[PDB]
Amino acid sequence: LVKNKCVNFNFNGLTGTGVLTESNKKFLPFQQFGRDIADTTDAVRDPQ
Amino acid sequence: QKLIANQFNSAIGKIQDSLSSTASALGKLQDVVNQNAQALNTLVKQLS
């Protein structure tokens, strides 16, 4: 897992491209993905 | 001339009171800010 650098990521079959970072987002246990105002994915949970 | 000068000075004083108290005076400029912000926010939401 790579952070603070631009990467062509794939989490659980959700492909994308971006700078991954750690985040302060307080996900509840049932949630795996977070969304922007645009419904573009905006945060993710690492499955491992 | 002293009366006309005092009336002008007093009238400029009333502008400061109006602009300090009453934000709705500038509504014609704030609506140009709001319309252009709302148009971009609508354009973003239409990605979803």
By what method was this entry solved? cryo-EM
Q: Which residue of A has its CA nearest to B43?
A: A38
Resolution in A: 3.1
Cβ within 8 Å, pair A40-B47: yes
Alpha-carbon span B11 to A20, nearest angstrom: 59
Residue A3 CA to chain centroid, in angstroms?
Answer: 11
Alpha-carbon span B38 to B45, nearest angstrom: 10
Residue B45, H or E segment:
helix B27-45
* 3-class DSSP assignment, residue B36: helix
The answer to whether B45 contacts chain A (CB < 8 Å) is yes
Q: Which residue of A has its CA nearest to B44?
A: A38
